[PDB]
Amino acid sequence: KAPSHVPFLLIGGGTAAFAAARSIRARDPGARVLIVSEDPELPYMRPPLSKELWFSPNVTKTLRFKQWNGKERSIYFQPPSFYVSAQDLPHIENGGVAVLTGKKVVQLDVRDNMVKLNDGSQITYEKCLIATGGTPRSLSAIDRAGAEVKSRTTLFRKIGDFRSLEKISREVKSITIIGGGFLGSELACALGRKARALGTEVIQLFPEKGNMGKILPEYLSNWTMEKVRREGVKVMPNAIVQSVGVSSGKLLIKLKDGRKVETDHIVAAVGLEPNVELAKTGGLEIDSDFGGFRVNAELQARSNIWVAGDAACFYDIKLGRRRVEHHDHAVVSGRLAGENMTGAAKPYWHQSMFWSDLGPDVGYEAIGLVDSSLPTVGVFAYGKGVIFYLRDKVVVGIVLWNIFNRMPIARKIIKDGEQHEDLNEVAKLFNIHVLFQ
Ligand SMILES: Cc1cc2nc3c(=O)[nH]c(=O)nc-3n(C[C@H](O)[C@H](O)[C@H](O)COP(=O)(O)OP(=O)(O)OC[C@H]3O[C@@H](n4cnc5c(N)ncnc54)[C@H](O)[C@@H]3O)c2cc1C
Ligand SMILES: Cc1cc(N)c2cccc(F)c2n1
């Protein structure tokens, strides 16, 4: 199936790879692009897997969802008709984009511009993108628990995880989410909606004082925790898991503070590990501070190799070295890498945003360096507001709380890098007419 040579080779079949393929085809008409994906699915977007796909009846099979406005669409970036087969990729007139599903790149040879797949086949390339993303982390307490505890613990990232968990929500009476970040909180609201209708139980526990405490200031994290609780979720903050075992057919979670939680299924949402296995054979540098492949401002690692998406630790000329795990960042960085694979030599400049919805009622957007450890200034009108994240009297990140269609304004504030004497006047740019943390 796989051709022996391809001009553009993209490793990984996710958001960053698809955005690069589209970018290569737009900037280089007639380009021949091969995506190698270890997953069996064609490229698809992940945000709906914890949101819109849960707020729909045949959705598990169709994988179509209604945006909050009402317009329906598919989770796949393009229908299969958009792609061509890998075998025919060298011969089709005006080229195309092919995906080799079910195949993993296991070896990378930078000197000879060659990769080896898990089935032994070898592919040479002229330009290559590493877009391998990451794999969910698991808790040490779950790893040492046993095969039964591990078989009843879900690490949520893929279409298969959505389907297996959606079925579980219709079979068991109690599901426990471990993790207070974006993913855990969105799954809590999603599973909580399903549980109100079926009369089941949803628990969310995490070590922080409130949901997304590592990201939002304490007061807003606490407000968010109460919103999640009003969705029918039992939220247990300040919870550190000591051990997990099976007791009377149920899962028993023992916390360090002495509390105990009985449940039927566990969903672990405790972060991501960048997929950097190819750095060994490839001789590529990994970043010990942020993880991931270390690349420069143009997302380049070596002469004919770029890295994009969750796996790329890059140099932001304005904000410094970073690694970002956002859907839009994978789109922006994948697109940029694609342009640089066709001669652009452009640095990461356009700042990608992220968003989170805890239902169709609570939503927030964000841009830049967003970290609750940074000094923050929040101007609210509760209901809505804007939180500025500061570094040396300069706004380096913004969180928009239930304020939409104003991300271009936030993007400009980060870019301009002004020293603002009155942030209440800057908040007026977001139609907000003050808390510190
Ligand atoms: C459930 C969920 C909800 C999310 N919601 C949001 C949201 O609301 N807002 C937001 O901003 N972000 C959200 N994100 C984050 C966003 O989805 C990620 O930032 C984005 O998917 C990263 O794209 P990527 O291309 O870098 O990696 P991935 O999408 O992970 O793609 C990597 C692909 O490469 C494959 N691969 C890995 N190694 C190899 C190899 N050696 N050979 C072949 N293939 C390989 C992997 O199997 C995977 O198929 C969400 C993520 C998840 C999981
Ligand atoms: C930056 C970001 C924002 C989200 N809303 C999100 C939701 C689920 C899983 C994730 F990894 C997420 N990451």
Author numbering: 127 to 182, 185 to 509, 560 to 611, 616 to 619
Quote the passages of the study that discuss this structure, keeping the authors' original sentences.
A 60-kDa FAD-dependent oxidoreductase, AIF allosterically switches between two distinct redox states. NADH binding by the oxidized AIF monomer reduces its FAD cofactor at a centralized active site, allosterically disrupting hydrogen bond networks to release a 50-residue surface loop (C-loop) and stimulate dimerization at the AIF surface.
To understand how SAXS CX1 and CX2 chemotypes engage AIF and enable dimerization, we crystallized select fragment hits with the W196A dimer-permissive mutant and wild-type AIF. Crystal structures of the W196A mutant bound to CX1 fragments and the underlying 4-aminoquinoline (4AQ) scaffold revealed that these scaffolds localize to the NADH active site, mirroring the native NADH ligand, as do CX1 and CX2 scaffolds bound to the wild-type protein. Aligned with this, AIF structures with CX1 and CX2 ligands exhibiting partial occupancy indicate mixed orientations of the F482 aromatic ring. Crystallographic complexes of CX1 and CX2 fragments with AIF(W196A) (C12, D3 and D1) or wild-type AIF (C9, C11 and D7) reveal stabilizing active site contacts and sources of steric interference that correlate with AIF dimerization rates. In their observed orientation, the methyl substitutions interfere with aromatic edge contacts to F482 and H454, which presumably slows stimulated AIF dimerization.
